[PDB]
Amino acid sequence: LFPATGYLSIVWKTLARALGLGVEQLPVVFEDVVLHQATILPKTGTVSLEVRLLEASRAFEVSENGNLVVSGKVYQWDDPDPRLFDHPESPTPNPTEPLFLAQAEVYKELRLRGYDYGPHFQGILEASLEGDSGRLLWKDNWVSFMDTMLQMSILGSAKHGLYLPTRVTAIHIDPATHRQKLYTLQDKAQVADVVVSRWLRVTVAGGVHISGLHTESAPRRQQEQQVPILEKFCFTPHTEEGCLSERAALQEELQLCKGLVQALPSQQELPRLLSAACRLQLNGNLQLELAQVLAQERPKLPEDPLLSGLLDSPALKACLDTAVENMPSLKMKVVEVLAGHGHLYSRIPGLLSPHPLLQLSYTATDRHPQALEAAQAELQQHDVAQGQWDPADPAPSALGSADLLVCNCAVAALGDPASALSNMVAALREGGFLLLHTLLRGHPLGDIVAFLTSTEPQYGQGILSQDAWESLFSRVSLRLVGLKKSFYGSTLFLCRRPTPQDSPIFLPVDDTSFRWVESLKGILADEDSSRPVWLKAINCATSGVVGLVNCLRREPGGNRLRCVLLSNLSSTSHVPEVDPGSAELQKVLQGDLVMNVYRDGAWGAFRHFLLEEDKPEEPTAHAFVSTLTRGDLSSIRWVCSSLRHAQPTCPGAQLCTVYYASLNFRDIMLATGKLSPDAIPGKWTSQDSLLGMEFSGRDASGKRVMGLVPAKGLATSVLLSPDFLWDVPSNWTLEEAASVPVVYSTAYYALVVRGRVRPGETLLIHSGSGGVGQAAIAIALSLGCRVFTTVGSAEKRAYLQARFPQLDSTSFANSRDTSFEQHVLWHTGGKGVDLVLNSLAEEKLQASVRCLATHGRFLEIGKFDLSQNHPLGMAIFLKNVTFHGVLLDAFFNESSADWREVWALVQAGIRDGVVRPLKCTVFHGAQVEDAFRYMAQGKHIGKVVVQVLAEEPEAVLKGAKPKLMSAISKTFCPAHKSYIIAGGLGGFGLELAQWLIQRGVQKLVLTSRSGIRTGYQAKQVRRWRRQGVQVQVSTSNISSLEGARGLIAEAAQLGPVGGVFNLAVVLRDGLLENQTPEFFQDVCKPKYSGTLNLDRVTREACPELDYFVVFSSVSCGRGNAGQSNYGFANSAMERICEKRRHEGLPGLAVQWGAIGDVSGTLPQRMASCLEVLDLFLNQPHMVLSSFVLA
Amino acid sequence: KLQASVRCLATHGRFLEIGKFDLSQNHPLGMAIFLKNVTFHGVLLDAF
Ligand SMILES: NC(=O)C1=CN([C@@H]2O[C@H](COP(=O)(O)OP(=O)(O)OC[C@H]3O[C@@H](n4cnc5c(N)ncnc54)[C@H](OP(=O)(O)O)[C@@H]3O)[C@@H](O)[C@H]2O)C=CC1
């Protein structure tokens, strides 16, 4: 975006040229600068900005493509006053804080906010913590300097979000005093001192003086935001059976197929084929007639759920990951046989996308060129190649040796099992894999397919018994590493070509001293030897050997690494013996898999799976409507509410159940995104919903009440001060009462309190149909005034006429047009109207002002003109006119003593009968989006209310609890509980702490060996303490068990322990040869030992704990080079977390690819990281991962 | 100087104008001030 200071600079240069002076010779003054729009500089091309000056009026105007962009007033400064640039009195006389933000931290904070400034705009050398005074650079560029001024001004604002300048009351520039003020540091760099005075709304530095700067929140909505890949790190046995048993549709399909088979109906292709086969004849069915039939000639059998059920199940992903893992290289070569019918080419490439560094060379082969001729576009979109090899014959040299083979024999027909397997194993490289999908004979579905397809013997041959397949594998000297089996007899074979037998090394890796590193370091050094090196740990289930091998394999010589781990999550589970003579070790050796993990009577390895896309939901009593995507009504959905944790004792609390909640224009503007949430007065969390202003429901005591709330009133419960509650009259209905509060309260405040309306006066009430208009009309007629009202349409006119008989046909006008001015002036004899209640647009507003009579009073309740700061000719005040700015939002913040006046007025109106409920259209809670759309259309008359809960016949109900309801899950914390973040003063720790506080923690303990030693840390800590949070700094190591106990105890003082997070990390990078046992001890001490100490102490004395999060890294699992110790520590942490959950205790381990704001994966922005952390916290899996693919 | 006076106002403030120069000249007045609850009064004893 083009900086506003850029506009100022170009205007200044234009004025200097017009006067003939040079820029540095011309002290200029700006006034009433206004930025109507922001210009976006394109990457390629140029944008022309045109500046026109009106010398007579001292006005300028910048335009682009004939569109106004900037306007204001500019003129030469006749008599510069050096007194002007003297630094103002400091708002805080004595900060007395040696700490101060440096350049890096300043722009780190600004990046967190959303500002991304490059080197040329990084002009702030330092800034005081409060952000009031600092030092700026002077690179001889004016635009950079003034933009740095604006940056300094923005740095102090507590409000979050992205704010940009919109108006500047006045700017003074004096190059001479600027040159005088500049002074040099020790370096040759030139600097100037800046001072910001929020009290006087003035920013002064060098020879510049900005006053009255006004910044307006930007939407801050960027398209094409990063989309992280979410996965769950789950254990996976090598062999499984009944994989798809959970699915019902598959079972129903099986029932249908067997039913047709019985005695020799659905949309699925296979049941349709069976029905066709049985249709022609009940007995003696022709093989030809059943083989061919319309709606079956297509290769839609694979599309049948039964046949391709396993492929859709994760088993395919597990097998593919297993194949990829045991690759000496980082590149994979895969070939598909009979691809025309297999169609795996359309599926396999998609599954391997998550791997960041993997490079794939896929090639599809078929018996005949015409087969697979179709879908050539599908092949083209992927990196695949055509093929002609027919498996029966020996493989062509072109394919040669490939890492992996995929067959999909279940649908494709194989000429002969033995011959095809021989050809394949010939094609398969040494140590490669053969993925084979087939249907097992002797199973119900197997027998059913055997009865069918008898016409083609080749397919019949493909169907074989499980033991037959196993025997076939042995004959071709192929070893079955793993097997996946469906519940209906389908299966998925994964076989590996044996590698030349070699004597394997054995190295215990369970020593706590890490001295085994030297032993391993020596062995790997002997790169000449090709003997595989088998690391095996059996002493501890928490050994993180998995991460170690994952990292080591990348480093040179890592090809020889192979792991064997025994981790049982149940003590009762026995431990197999891994002695060389023991059978199990020999079996795993024959398999020759990199990862061999045994857990509770099963051999397997950890795998990555994409987790469910759906957002978790739970049944809750407290939930509030929210828009998950700002500006989209389609996203409106219910979310869990923080009200679950609340104190009923407090008299100010007065928690109330919600039955009907109304919608107002403000709610639509918020949902539509036309109104920024920050525009709502008050201190609001960044993540929250500000929908709904009024409601009506039963109090905690059951008494029916209607209430008014600043926001969050559209929910199943509201926390409200009793001052904002009225008792519903016995004759009203809770639905009716849902409309009275806001409209009547604002009408009374506008007329009686401010306008001081007297009986017999004259009024002009715009938008009579609207709720506020109806309330105002009802109030006025009671006094006995004469009313003029404007209505958009004829039906609204008729409705108002019916509702208010006293009102007359001459009391109407047209609102959408500006013709009412003539009508009012004519029917009033030209005198005008005493009182005006205006809520219309700029031109309508100007028209209304002319309607005022002498001693008139203008009541303004709109916002558009006020926000835009449109001018108002003051000549109207020559009469005794009084202009009122009426905002009801002020009461919710202060002046409650004043608010009681309006409360009494509304109560008196209610009891006297003046107050009448408006017409209501009811939408059920589940249809809230429909209500929003209907009100957005603008055809509604009266109010739109959402029936959150139906009213009971009883007048007063003892238990007013809301009915349980299902909504999206969110994370909130009780106020009384205490939370601990180990190493919370790091880059991630502080951001996580802030995120938690926004969830209402109120009691925090941050651990760090060094303690507060940076300006940013001190700034954040003091900011939090100002909000009332009880922050604490420990400096107690979690590595030492005594240290962990002390940390927990001191945390308990603030209150019961709620959650503990382990973000402590010390890293010592370097290749294995460089690593030494000391570095491993140092790296694992805060992460491995600390986690064990925290687990022990928490399980000992933290009964109320519910959150136990341990931050791991993607390097573990995925693998990375030169970070073996890091991977080991992370893997150990993950193992501890996995064990904890098995016992019912809470525990979580998160793997982050990279953090940007504070291995082929781009750094992830902090906002996305926190969102994903919330989602993870709400999920039940033991370990989760997140990263952004390059 | 009139513009300077407007800025000094606080929320719920009231502005009482008794000078008749700017009013007669019909000089502009930014309406953004009214966002803060504010009542701009045009005082003229002459009416009585
Ligand atoms: N103290 C304060 O600052 C407060 C201010 N207010 C203001 O009161 C005003 C009136 O609110 P209220 O009458 O309850 O609003 P409603 O939406 O209930 O009524 C809107 C009225 O104005 C017109 N209108 C407004 N918005 C739309 C729209 N999106 N689509 C179609 N027609 C629309 C309608 O047509 P038509 O007019 O043509 O018949 C209708 O008469 C608002 O401007 C609000 O900001 C309210 C309370 C507090």
Ligand SMILES: NC(=O)C1=CN([C@@H]2O[C@H](COP(=O)(O)OP(=O)(O)OC[C@H]3O[C@@H](n4cnc5c(N)ncnc54)[C@H](OP(=O)(O)O)[C@@H]3O)[C@@H](O)[C@H]2O)C=CC1
């Ligand atoms: N890209 C990333 O940053 C990624 C982060 N992670 C993990 O996420 C977490 C957050 O990392 P992040 O905060 O960015 O990194 P930091 O390096 O900033 O975290 C280390 C912090 O912990 C403190 N600390 C060190 N030892 C201890 C100890 N024994 N007890 C208490 N505090 C201690 C350090 O202070 P001091 O040195 O003075 O003790 C420092 O403040 C870490 O667990 C990290 O491993 C993993 C994946 C990606």
